[model samples]
Target chain A: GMKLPRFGVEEWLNVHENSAIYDIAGVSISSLTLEELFALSGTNPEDFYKKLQGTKLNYGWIEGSPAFKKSVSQLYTGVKPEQILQTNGATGANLLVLYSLIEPGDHVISLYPTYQQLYDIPKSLGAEVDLWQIEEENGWLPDLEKLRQLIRPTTKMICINNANNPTGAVMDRTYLEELVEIASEVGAYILSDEVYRSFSELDVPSIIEVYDKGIAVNSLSKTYSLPGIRIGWVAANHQVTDILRDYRDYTMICAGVFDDLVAQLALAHYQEILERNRHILEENLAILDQWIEEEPLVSYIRPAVVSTSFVKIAVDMPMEDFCLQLLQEHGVLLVPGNRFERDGYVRLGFACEQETLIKGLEKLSQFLRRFD
Target chain B: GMKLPRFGVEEWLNVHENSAIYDIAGVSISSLTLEELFALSGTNPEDFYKKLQGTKLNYGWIEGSPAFKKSVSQLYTGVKPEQILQTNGATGANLLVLYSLIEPGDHVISLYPTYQQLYDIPKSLGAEVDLWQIEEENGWLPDLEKLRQLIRPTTKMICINNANNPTGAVMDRTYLEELVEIASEVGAYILSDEVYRSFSELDVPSIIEVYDKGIAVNSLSKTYSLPGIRIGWVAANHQVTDILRDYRDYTMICAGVFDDLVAQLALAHYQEILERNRHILEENLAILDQWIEEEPLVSYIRPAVVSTSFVKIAVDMPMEDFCLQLLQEHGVLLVPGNRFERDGYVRLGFACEQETLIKGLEKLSQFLRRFD
Candidate 1:
C-alpha cells in the first residue's frame, strides 16, 4: 500500500545496523571525526569555533554559499558554480530532480541493481520506469544496444549510477559518450549519480561534463566520507537548475547553515580526504580480492570502483533470511541481493577497515557452510 | 510544465531579500548565533567543543537520538520520546507525511493563507486538496462549519498550521477539539504544523495531544530561533511513525550527526530560549501596533501571536508590485499576500529587532505617500 517500492537497502540497513558488530554493508569510506578532519585538512578547530560564534543561524544562503558553490564546482568540468544547487543529500538531490521532472505517462530507463531512488522514485511519480539490467555475464556492465532498444518517444530520462552501487561498475568516458549519443538522439535527459566518482581505476568525466542534458549528482557522503554533513548538489544547465531550485522551495528552503560550512571545509580539503580514503580502500580491496579467490561459496566480478560490489552467493535460501541469520549469529552485516531486486547475490563493501572486512567475510563464509 | 505551483513566498524573498535593508517579512524570530545560544543556555562552549572533537560524523542516529526524542517530547503532552521522528526540517517532515499518505483519488482539507506546503504539496501529489478558508472578517479564525461542509468520505487528512503563517492565526483549544471531533467522525488524520507553538496568547494543545490520529510537527526554527541547525520532528503514533520511517529511507538516511546534538542541547534549555524570544517579540509587537494605527494605507486585524500579522493594504495595484517597489525605493521588505494567494494583504513580521521594525515602518510610511 506504500506509494513506491520498498526502499530495501535503507530499510534493511536501519533494522540491523545498530546491532551489527561488523558493518561490511557500509557504502561510505570509513568516516572521520571533526578533530580528524580538521587535522587532515590542516585547519584549526579554533577557527571553526570562531566562525560558529559570530554566525547568525538564519538560512545562511538560499542556494548555497559562494565558497560552497566554488568548492562543489571543483568536482566536475564544464559545470560552473552557478550550475549547482545544494540539497539535503544525494537522496534529496535525486528526489528534487525526479519529483520536478517526472510525472504520469513519462518513460524512464534506469540501470537496475543500482540505487533504488533512481528507478523507484520515477515509478512512484507515475512514470513507467524500464529497468536496464547490468548482467554479471557481461562483467556487470549495462548494454548500450539494449538501452537503445528500450527507448521511447516518451522517454523523459535515462537514469544511471556510476560508479554504480551494488555492482561496482564504472563507465569510462567512451562508454558515457556512447550512452550520451543514444540519449541525445532522442533528446532525453541523463541523470547520473556520481557519488563514487574519482574512486575509479581511470578518472571518468561527470555526465554533465560530457553531455549538455546530463544532471550530475555528487555528495561528500561517499567520496569524502562526510555523510554527517548532509550536503549534496545537482549539476545541470540553467533551465534544469531553475526547475530544481523552484521545486526545492517546497521541499526545503536550504540545507542547514552550519552543515554548509562543514561541507565547504571538507570540500576545501577534498584531495587530502580522498587520499586518506584511497589508502584505506586500496588496502581493504586487496584483502577482499584474496578472500574472494579462496572462498568457494561467494565471488564477485570486481570493478575499478572500490566501495561496494555485488557478490554471487551460492545459496538455496533467500538472501534476506541468510543476511538476518548471519547478523543474529555473528553480528556481521552485508546487503543481500534481493534488496537491490537482484536475487542470488549480496552486496559487500570493501571500503571498511581491512580487519572489519576480513572478519565480516569470515562470518559470511561460516554462515554459507550451513548450505554445504 | 512544473509539477508544483510556484513557491511564491520563497521566490519573492529570493529576488529582493539580500538587497532589502529592512527585512520585516522574515519568518524566524531573529536567528541566533552559537555564542549567544550557548550563553543563553548557560552551557559551556568548552564542553560542546570537547564533545564535537570526539564525535564521529557518520549518520549518527537512524530515527533520532534518545536525547533528541526526549527533548522534543517535552513540547507536546501525551507524545512520548519513542513517538517522535527527527527530520531534515519541518519541510522534510511535511514532504515525508504527504508523500507517504496522499495519492490520486484522495482528498485533503488544509487551512487557506497558511503555509503553501500544507495545501500545494497535496495537489502536486495528485490528491484533491480543498482550502478551508481562514476569514479575516472573523479575525483570521477558520469557521468550523465551513470545514464540516468541506469534509468528504474520501478525505484522508486535515492539515492546519496552528500559530499559522501569513495571518498569525492560532487555533485555541476549544476550536481544535471541535475540529478533532469533526475529523474523528470521518476517520481522517489531523496534521498540525506547530512550529510557532508556545508563542500564542492562549496555550494551544498540539493535535497529537488532542486526537489519537493526529500528527504534530515542531521545529527549532521559529520558536527556539535555531533555523540554521535545520532540525525538526514529527510527533505521531506508532503506525504513522512506521509509515514515515519506512518512506524516509528514500528521502534521507538520517538528519546530520552534528545538528542532532545541537538540537538536543537547545531543547534542553528551550525555556531560556523561549524567554529570550518572548522579550524580543513582545517589544516589537507594540511598535508594530502603534505604527499600524497611524499608517493610513494599511490596517491589520491584530492577534495575540507576536511574530507575524496579515495587514490589509488599501491599494489598486497588485501587492506583489507594491511590495517590490517598496523594497526597491525604500529598502523595506514585506511579503505580499498574493504570495500566499490572498491579495490586498501583506504578511509583516514584527519579531525582528525593534530598531529594524521602527526604521522599516518609517520607510513604508514615506513610500505610502506616493500611493496617496
Candidate 2:
C-alpha cells in the first residue's frame, strides 16, 4: 500500500544532482573549506587533528553530547540544553515533531508553497490539513483573517515555514504573534520550520519566544551553509522534547560524534560563520535584484534576506516543460513551480559562488528569450 | 499520547553515556585516531585537508553519491549500486524497511533479544509479531523447525540480526537458507541486519546474496568502529529500494556530503581497517574468554566472532539490582538482562581499549565477589 504523498522536491533534487548544469538551484550559500572553517573558528589544523586523534570514533553521545546541546541551547533564551533534540537535519526535525504530535483525524493547518513536509507529513499521518495560501498579490503573506476563520477546537497544529522556502516571504514578529494568538484559541501547537529565519536583517522572533506551545525547527544546513554536516535541532518545552526523544530512537541512533563536534564548533563560532554567510547572501541577492530588473518578462517579490526567490515568468509554456528545456538546452537549472504545486513561477536559488550564479542567470535569461 | 512501545535498549544506552563508569558496555570496536585512520588510508593530514579545502560543504548528493553507492554495492555480490539506499545508520535502515513493508494486521516474526529495533519497530507498525526465542542451551541459535512453524500466509517479513548483538551468536549459512525457504513459502521478505557479519571467519552469506526477497541492512558503526560517521545503507532489490525511496523523503533529506566522502574512504581502505579490527577483536575476545573462566559466578556461550557476549550471572539479587549496585559501587557499567526483557543474563562488551576492558572486568569481578 503506497500511501505517502508525492515528493516532487525530492525527485527534482535527485535529478539535479546527476544533471550537468550551471547550478543556481541550491539553497545554502557557498560551503567553507576545512582550512576556512578552522580559521573562522579561530583554531589551527594542529588542534583539530589533536582533538580528532583523541576522540574515540565510538558513539560518543546518543541524544547529543552535552557540549553540543549546550551550544544549541544558547540559541534560544528560555530553553535549556535538555530541551533541545538534535535530528538528522531540519527535515528530520519537522518529521519528528509532526510524528509525535499528530494523530489520525487531528486537524492541522499548514501554509502552502512552503516545504512539502510541513504539510504532506501531517496529511500522511491522517490529519485533516488545510492549506493556507500565500497570495502573490498580497506580497506572499498569509491572510490573518483567513487563518482566524480556519481555527477550530479540533485544530491540533498550525505549521508554518518562516522566511518561507521558494517564495522567500518572511512573516514579521507581529504576524507571528497574531498566529500564536489564533493557535492559542484552539489549544493548537505551532510548528515553525525556521531553517531560513536567520537570513532576515531584523531580529526575527522565534515561535518559541512568542508561544509556549510553539516548536521551532532549525539546522546549520541553510543559515550556516553546513548542510554537509546534516545536523538539526528542535527548540521546545520539556514535554515536546521528551516525546521526541522516544520517537528519535526508531528514526536513527546518535548523530555521529564527528558531526556533533563540527556542529558544536560551528555554533561556538556562530558569529564568525554568520558574518561570512551574510556577506555572501547580501552580495548575491544584490546581483539577483539587478538581474530581475534587467529581465523584462520576470517579476518577483524582491527577497528581503533569503538566498532563494520565486520569480514569475511571462512564458506561455508549462513550467515543467520550460524548466526541462532550460536544463537541456541552456544547461541552466531552476526548480519548476509545479514541483511545489504552484504554476507560472520558478524558484531561483542565488546561493552559489558569484561566477556560477552570474553564468547561470545569463543562461536562464537566454532560455527565457526563446519563449518571447 | 504516548502509545509507542518502550525502547529499553535506547534507555539503557542513554544512561550508559551519562554515567561516569568503566565502560565495558560499548557495541562498536575501539575507535581509530585521525592519525591511525590516515595511516591506514595511505593519506596524510596535509593531503586530507587539501582535499577538504576544495570540497563544497553544500548538499552533495540526495540518494548518496555515485562513489558512495559503488563502494557499498561492492559489499554484496550481484547487487548494483542502484539497489542500495543510504540511510542515517542501521537503525534508520531497519525503520525504513519496516515502515515500507509492514501494513497493519500483517504477521512478522523477529528474532528476540537481538537489536530491539528488529522486533519493536515492526510491532510498532501494527504488525502482529511473534518473537522466535534463542535458547541459551542451544548456543543462542534459533531452531529452523520453530521458524517453519511460525511462518504464515500473512507473514510479511522475517527479521534477524546475523552475528546478533548482545549475544554475539552468528547464524550460519545453512540456517539462513532454511529461513529463506520458510519465508519464500509465505512470500515474506527477509531483512537481515548484517552489521556484525564481517567479524566472522567462516564465509557468511548476505541475505541479499542468498534470497531474491532478502534485504540486508548494515553500517560503518560496528565492525568498522566509525559510529561517529553515522552512515548506513540498505541493500535490496529494485522494488524494495524504490518503495523505501518514497518513505525516505518523509524521514530525512540526505546524509551529509562530508560523511559520504569519509564512508567512501573507509570502504576503499576496507582491508586495512578490517585487519586492524580483527587483530583487536581476536586479542580482546581472548582476554574476555579467560576472564569468564576465572570468574566462577559468570557463565557465557562463548562468542564465535562477535564483539559482545551475554553472560548469565550467579547472584541472588535481581539482574537489575545486581547491575545497578555494580555500577554504583565499582563504576563499571553492564547492560542488565532485564532491559532486554530477559533476566539473569547481562551483556558484556569486550570491544574496547584493552586496558580499559581489563580494568573494568577486574572491578566487575570485585563487585561480584561481595555477593558470594
Candidate 3:
C-alpha cells in the first residue's frame, strides 16, 4: 500500500519534450546519427542494413546473446559473459538488483542528489534507508567518515551513483576501493549505478573491478549515445548475477531482438564510440565553463569528467519556478534542483549538440539578465 | 525472502534458439521481413531508413510519447490516451500491475497452462494463488463453476491469459463476462493477459471492455509480429493507471526513443499489419490442419484462430524426453508439456513460415515413426 513518490525531474521533462525548445536538461550525451554510427564502427551502411533485414524478429536469447554478453564482459576484467544480465536500460538493471537484494526491514544507505530511484525505491520496499548526503562545498563528494558512521551490521546494501547524476562528481579509484573495503567489513553488497562512469576524463575503475560483491549497472544510453537501443547490463559476481537473472524474469522478459543487435554493434566499436563522445564532452565542457565564468550569478564546482553540472543560482526565487519560467518564456529546459531533493540550484546538461547548448545558454543568460 | 521459480518454457527456448533446428516452438507469429513490413505499410525503405537516421537517440518521453499513447488508446473504446501505460512488454505490464496491487497473503487466482510469470510473480509477492485448471478435454477452457468456487471475500485479483499460451484456447465472450461478474462480486480486480486476443477467430472482448475493474495487458509481439520493438501497454481506469504509473517509475524509466517511433508507425498501419497476419494465420492453420490429420499419433483440438495448438502425442516416453529426442534426431523444436506444468503433451506452433512448418512437420513425422 506504499505510495511511490513521483519522479520530479521526469514529471517536469515529460510536459516539455515535444515543445519547440532548446533542450539542455537531458541526461544522455548528444546522440549519434546513423551515419555517425557507421563511421565510428567502420561499418558499411548497406551491409548493416542487410544484416538488420536478416535479423529474426523473434524473442531474443533470454540472457542476451553470447556476443552481446561477451562485449559487455570485455568492458571489465575478471568477468565472463555469464556474469552479465541484459536489462531494459540501466534503470531496469538497478531495479533488478534492488528487487533481488533488498527486503522489508533491510537497512540501506544511498547517496542523495544522485538518482532519486537509488534511494526512493529502497524506501518503498520498506527498507530502513539513511541518506549519505554529498556536500556541494566538498566538490559534491560523499564523505567517507560520514559513510563509515552510517553503516550498521544490519545494512544489507550501499548504493552509489558514480560520476553522480546531475552533479557529475566522479568518485576516484581510491575512494571506490575504500567503499568496497567498508562494504566488505559489513558483509554488505555495493550497488553502483555507473551509467556515467566512462564520461570521466580520469580513468575511473568500475565498482565491479574494485570489489567482488559490487554490482555495476550501465547502458548504451549515456556514453555511447544509443538510448534508442534501450539495452543495458548488470555486471556482478556469479551469485548476484544468478539472483538477478531470476528477478529479471519478473521485471522484463527480454530486451528486444533488434535492440540486442544494435547494442552489440555499439559495444563492438565501444572504444571508438567513447572517443567520439569524449571529444564532444570536452568541447562542450569548455563552452559551459566560459558561460559560467561570464555569468556571475551561477557558481559550480566544474565537473572533471561528467555531462551535467549542478549549479547554484543566485536568484531569490525557488529553483522550480526559475526552471519553469525559463522554459515557458525562452523555450529552453534545465532541471530544477528540487527535483533531486535539493534547493536553490539547477542541473545544466552540457552534453547536448553544440548549437543547441550555446543557444540555450544565451537564451538563459538573457532571461537571467532581466532579473539583474 | 521469496524465491521466484524459473520459467520452464523460457529455459527450454533459450537453449534451442541458435541451434540449426526447425523451430515450431516459437510463440510469436512468423516474423515480418523488412521488405514485407515496408510493403505491408506502404512505406519506402529508403524513406524509412532516412527517417530513422534523423530520429534522436535519447531518453524518450517518460510515460511514452503522446502519439504512442494515443495509438495504444485507440485499441479500445471508453478509454483515452491518458489511461494507457506503455511498458517494456506484456511481462513488464503484468508485473507492474501485480507489484502495485498485491501484498503478502492476498488471495489470487490464475489460469494454469498460461504464462508462468502470470501466476509465479504473484506467488513470489506472497499472494496465496490458486490455479484455475484448464482441461484439454474441455477444449482447453476453464470450468467456470470451479472459478466461482475459487473466489473468496479476501480474493484480491483473478489473473487469466486469454488465448492461453501453449493451448491457444480462446476464452469466449460469455466466459470472460462471467469471470468479470465473479470478480466484481468479490470486489476484486481481474487482470487478463490479452496479448493473443486479436488472433482469435471470434470477436472477443478485452477485460477492460467487459468490466471497469478489469486490467488488460497486451503487446505488439504476438498479434502485430513486432517483438523486435518490445513495446506493450496496460489499459485500465484512471485510478489504476495512476497507481501503475507511480509504480512504473521504479520499474521502468522509458521504453526507448526509436522504439516509440516504430510502435507509433506500427499502430498507424495496424489494420494493414493485421490483414497481413490474418492471411498468414489462415493459410498456415490450413497446413497445420492437414498435418495434424495425417499424423495419427498426434491429436489436437484445432485452435479457434490461434497461432499455436497443444498436441497430445501417443508416444511411450514422457513429453520432455519425446521433445528432446525429436529435436536431436530431426532438428525440430517443440515445447515439452512439462514446461507448462502438464505432461504427455507438447506445444506445436504453426505460426512459423509455411516452408519451415511443412518441413518441420515432415521431419517430426520421421522422428515419431521410430516410436511407432
Candidate 4:
C-alpha cells in the first residue's frame, strides 16, 4: 500500500518462491552436529550445554571475544585477533565495509554475474558501479588486463567474490596479488567475499594474505555448514577493524551470544568441518561430474571444482522463469543465471546430501529431456 | 596506523573506552527468565531443549513465527499478528521505519534528548532533522504545538521515545492522541520508541494504539529485563509490516532460534516479569525520592515517576568529565547529561538491586558533596 525501500531484485524473488524452490537462495547451513560445534570450541557439547544453561549470554563479545577472534584469526595469515570484527553474516560484514568505505560519487568495480548485492548496495549509496565481466571462454576468471583498464584514480573500491557464487570461480593467490597491485596503483581497497571459501577444492588465498588494504568478508554458512549460526566476520588490518567496530554499532548492535557461542565452536573445529565438507563436496562432485558428463543438454565451466556448479543451460525459457517452473512443477529449485546478469546458466548447489543432490539432478535431467 | 574506513563516532568511542575508564554508560538489562519467554511461544524451555538436543535449529522463522507475532501483537490494543514484525531490537525497528520512510531532503521532527540513533540515522540518510525540545519544566513531554510548528510539506516523520530513556518521562494517552493529530494533519508517520514500556506507576499510551500511521518499537529489554534475548518487534499496520519485512532482510537476516525460543518464553509470562520490574522501580524510586529530597545540591523534576531519574546538578565542571570522575573516584556511574543533549543534569538508573542502588547513591552523594 505504501512506497517501500527496495533492494535490488529481492522484490521480484517472491514470484519465484513457488517454482523450483531449491531453497539455496535462502539456504542457511546449520546442519553441523553439536559434536562439531563443541569440537570447534575445544570442548564437549555436554559441558558447553551446561555453561549455556547457567550463564547470562548477555551481549557476548562485541566484536567476538578474544577466543572467537583468535579462532577466526587462525583462518588467516599475518593477522591478530584484534583484526577480526565478527558480524551477523558475510552480508552484514559486507554491508558495513561498503558503508564505511564507499560514499556518494565513489567508483566501485564488481564482478559481472556475481551476487547482485555486491553491486546493488554500492549503487544504492550513489556510487558508480562498473561490472568487470568474467568470460566463460576463460573459465569465468576476470581478464586481468581488462581489470587493469577499468581501474582509475577515482575508483575507491573493488569487490571480488572469491570462490564466486554462481560461477564458483576463484582467483588464485597470484591473481589476487596482481589485483592487490592494481589496487595499490589506484589506492583502492579490495573486499573479498569469501563465503564460498571452505567449499573450494583448490587452494584459495584470502585477500588479507595478499594486500595490506585487503578486507575479507567470510561466514560459516557456505563453509562450515553452520549458516544457521548466522555468524560471519570481517578480517582486515587493525585500523579497518576499529572503523568497522564503530560502523557496526549502527548496523548490528552486536552478534547474538548463542550465534557467537556456536560460531566459536564452528571456527575452533573449522578444519575438521572443512575436511568433512571437502569429502562431501568431493564425493558429490564426482557424482555430479559423471552426471554432467553423461548429460549433453548442459555443460559447465568447472571453476575451482566445488560443491556448486554453474551450468550453462540449453533451454527454451528465461532462466528465472525456467527455475520457477522447475521449482513449481518438479520441486527442483535453481538460481537463475540472469539474476547474476548471465543468461543461459543456472547455479546448482551440490553440498546438500548426496541422495538429494542425485535425485534433484535426475529430476533436472528429466525436465531437460522435455526441453529438447 | 593506516587510515582505515573510520566509523567516525565509533573511533571516538573506542578511544573513550580505552583512555577514560568510566563506570556504566551502558547498563543492559539481564536475561529473560523461562516464564517471561513462554509468552512468545507456548513451548516450554525444558521440553524444547530436550527436543532440540538431537535436532537442527534451522532458522526457525524468516521474519517471526505466527506465534511470536501473536505474542508481540498482544502487547498493543487493536493490533493484529500480521502487524507485528520481529526485529533485532528497537534500534533495528527504528532503522527500518526510518529507512522505509525518509528520503533524501525529507524533514523529520524528533523528540530532543531521545535515543541517538533515532536522529542519527535519519540525518545520516540525508534527511533534515528538527528537534522538538522536551523541557525539564514540562517533565520531558513533547510540546505538541511546538512539534506542529516544525512541520513542513517535506516533513515525513516524527519520532518519540515513550517513557523516554535517561529521563524516563511517560506520555499519557491524551498527549499521544495529540501527537496522532499532528501527524494526521501533516500526513507524516509517527515513530515511537517504546523500549522501556510498563516500568512505573505512570502509564503511557502506545503510539500503535494512538495513531493509524503510528509505529511502535519495543523489545525484551528494560521492562522485561531481557536484553540478553535480543528480541524486539515493531507493531505497525500490515502495509508497513511488509515494508519492514523487506528492510529487515537487509539488517539482520533473521533472529536466532534459541533467542526466539527464549524471547517467546519471556512474552508468555511477561506479566510476572513486568510486575517484578515495576516493584523494583517503585521501591528504587522511593529511595531516589528520599535522596533527592535531602540533597540540596541536586534538583530534578522527579521524572513524573519512573525507573530512572535525572538530577540537575549545581556543578561547575563539564557534565561528561564530572560523570567520568564520579565513576572513577566513587565507583558510582551515572550517565552524563551530554549523552541526552542536556548539560545540566546527570541521569541515574534506579533499576539496580536495593543494596547496590543504596551503595551507588551513597558513593554518588559523597562524590557530589564536594561538587557545589
* TM-score of chain A, predicted model 3, versus the true chain A, to 2 decimals: 0.97
Query: Among all windows of ten consecutive residues in candidate 4 chain B, which has the lowest summed lDDT?
Result: B1-10
Q: Please give, for every candidate in the order listed, the TM-score of chain B alone compared with the true chain B.
A: 0.97, 0.96, 0.96, 0.89
User: Superposing all C-alpha atoms, what RMSD in Å does each candidate have to the true structure?
Assistant: 1.4, 2.7, 3.4, 3.5
Ranking by lDDT: 1, 3, 2, 4
Task: Please report the candidate that would top lDDT against the real structure.
Answer: 1
Tens digit per residue, CA lDDT, model 1, A203-300: 58999989999998888888888888889889999889887777786777788888899888898998899889988877888888888899888888
lDDT of 1 at B199: 65
Instruction: List candidate 2 stretches off by more than 4 Å.
Output: A65-67, A101-106, A126-128, A201-203, B1-3, B65-67, B100-107, B126-128, B370-372
- Model 4 spans with C-alpha error above 4 angstroms: A1-5, A8-30, A33-43, A198-201, A303-307, B1-24, B32-46, B304-308
**lDDT of candidate 4 over A1-372, digit per residue (tens):** 122246433544544544543454443232665554555446866666666666555555677777898988888888888899888778678878886676767899998767656776676565788989888888789898999889888788899888777777788877787888889998798998888764554567899898888999998777777765567889998777766676675666777777787777667667777777777777877887898888988888775655566888887679888877778778887777776677788877776766777888888898888877
The fnat score for candidate 2 comes to 0.63
- By TM-score, the best candidate is 1
Mind giving the per-residue lDDT tens digits that candidate 3 earns over A43-155?
88878788876676666667788999999999897888899999988878888888778776789999987787799777756688999999988889989999999999878
| lDDT: worst 10-residue window of model 1 chain B | B1-10
lDDT of 1 by residue, B1-372 (tens): 445776888778767788889988996788899899899989899999999888888888877899999888877777888889998888878878888778776899999878888988888777788989988888788899999899997689999998888777788888889999999998999989888765656868889988999998878888888888788889999888887777886777788887888898898998999899988877888788888889888898875665778889898999989988999898999999888888998889878788888999999999888888
lDDT for B369 (candidate 4)? 79
**Candidate-wise lDDT, in order:** 0.85, 0.82, 0.83, 0.72
Show where candidate 1 strays beyond 4 Å. Answer: none
Ranking by TM-score: 1, 2, 4, 3
